[PDB]
């Protein structure tokens, strides 16, 4: 119960995350899927949610909220409408590649986990929204679904079970905002990817005005083997409040950038050193790291040596975990340029319906460009902090938060570099 980050391959819940054995059915069936799914389904729905609540499985997307509670919001019967299950694969946040690398190389985990989630909840079918740029991955997935339909695992008798299910694959069109719970839903409905206000919640009224619970790829893909192996076993790894395995995408300024499944609450330094061998120039050459993709603030190397890769730890460090897409800077790169690029991205990917992210994100983009060039003065730094705090909790969706948090992470840990660039531009 102390200093545990390393593990073995019996626990690797993504046994083919590198496409080394097989992605089709014949080859996936060997890796422990579609095994006892009839027994799982007919065991009961509440048994599945009990396994979830005992596993302590938090949402492995951006906003980590405990599942079981989330999936139990539509255990109630239907008052004259069908129910649906939207699997989210608009993996648009920077640094995040894990959902791609499972979409290809292990689609059947996803399919059976989605079925299991539906029968745990109630669902006529499912809608696997996938990014528009993921054409070949989506086609691998469609082939897997076709093999499943042919083998008799889905449809009029889903592995028997006295329960009928379908699995659809909706295809996006290239917008990061369509990863949100509600923009995704409206895009499936056939409109712009503009989020809704929440309330209403998708479990009372969602896609097509019907109940839904949106879920990420791995959030469901780990469901069936959790049911198959218990919440005790999944909760045994990781701290008591945020447990389980975790895919970890690593990018930038490290010798061997990679995707890894690892034990949650592993230290960031253990993670970087074991897999994706040491950063360029070694640890001393480290400058800052972003643990999430881009909707999480910076880390200054002062709390990289004494921090666990968890929700609670990074929250204690005035930061947060999202999809856990580690990104590294190594003293050889302008950092304000990087964060200005992130804000340029968050400007391009805004929907625009709510005023703060419509305007203030463009404010911050322009101001951070001006800080890159050094054409500002330090009385604007706290002004821009105030602009961030205006944008934070004044929005419909959490893209304003994601735009405002890297800003705060830079102002909190790298203000003197802004000061230096300003005085340099002023002198010259």
């Amino acid at each position: 119960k102390t200093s545990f980050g390393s593990l073995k391959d019996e626990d690797r819940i993504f046994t083919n995350l590198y496409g080394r054995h097989d992605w089709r059915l014949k080859g996936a069936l060997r890796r422990g899927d579609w095994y006892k799914t009839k027994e799982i389904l007919l065991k009961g729905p509440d048994w599945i949610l009990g396994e979830m609540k005992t596993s302590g499985l938090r949402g492995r997307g951006g906003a980590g909220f405990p599942t079981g509670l989330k999936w139990s919001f539509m255990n109630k019967p239907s008052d004259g409408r069908p129910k649906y299950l939207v699997v989210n694969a608009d993996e648009g946040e920077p640094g995040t590649c894990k959902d791609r690398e499972i979409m290809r190389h292990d689609p059947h985990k996803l399919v059976e986990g989605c079925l299991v989630g539906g029968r745990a909840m109630g669902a006529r079918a499912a809608y696997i929204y996938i990014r528009g740029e993921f054409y070949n991955e989506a086609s691998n997935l469609q082939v897997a679904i076709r093999e499943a339909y042919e083998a008799g695992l889905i449809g009029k008798n889903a592995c028997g079970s006295d329960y009928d299910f379908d699995v659809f694959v909706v295809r996006g069109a290239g917008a990061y905002i369509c990863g949100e719970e509600t923009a995704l839903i409206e895009s499936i409905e056939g409109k712009q990817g503009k989020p809704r206000l929440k309330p209403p919640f998708p479990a009372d009224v969602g896609v097509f005005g019907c109940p839904t619970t949106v879920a990420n790829v791995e959030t469901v893909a780990v469901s069936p083997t959790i049911c198959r192996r218990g919440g005790t076993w999944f909760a045994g790894f990781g701290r008591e409040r945020n447990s389980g395995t975790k895919l970890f995408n690593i990018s930038g300024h490290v010798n061997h950038p990679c995707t890894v499944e690892e034990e949650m609450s592993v230290p960031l330094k253990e993670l970087i050193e074991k897999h994706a061998g040491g950063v360029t120039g070694g640890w001393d050459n480290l400058l800052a790291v972003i643990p999430g993709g881009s909707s999480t603030p910076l880390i200054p190397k002062s709390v990289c040596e004494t921090v666990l890769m968890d929700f609670d730890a990074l929250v204690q460090a005035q930061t947060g975990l999202g999809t856990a897409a580690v990104i590294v800077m190594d003293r050889s790169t302008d950092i304000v340029k990087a964060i200005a690029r992130l804000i340029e991205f968050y400007k391009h990917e805004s929907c625009g319906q709510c005023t703060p992210c419509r305007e203030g994100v463009d404010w911050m983009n322009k101001v951070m460009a001006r800080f890159v060039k050094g054409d500002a003065r330090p009385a604007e730094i706290d002004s821009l902090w105030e602009i961030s705090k205006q944008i934070e909790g004044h929005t419909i969706c959490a893209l304003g938060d994601g735009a405002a948090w890297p800003v705060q992470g830079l102002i909190r840990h790298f203000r003197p570099e802004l000061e230096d660039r300003m005085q340099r531009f002023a002198q010259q």
Binding site: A379, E380, D382, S383, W385, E386
Partner: protein, 56 residues
């Protein structure tokens, strides 16, 4: 300014006190009429930060 130094004396005696120094008229001791441009200052509430109208 031009009082020929004896009429100056007459008026300073009849009055009771020197008035060539404290004259009713203005010759060259006045602020001239075309001036440099200023730069007027700027009061508080121009703080650019930590300045919300609900507080002041």
């Amino acid at each position: 300014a031009s009082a020929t130094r004896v009429i100056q004396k007459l008026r300073n005696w009849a009055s009771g006190q020197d008035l060539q120094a404290k004259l009713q008229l203005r010759y060259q001791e006045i602020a001239k009429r075309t001036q440099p441009p200023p730069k007027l200052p700027v009061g508080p509430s121009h703080k650019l930060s930590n300045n919300y109208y609900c507080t002041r």
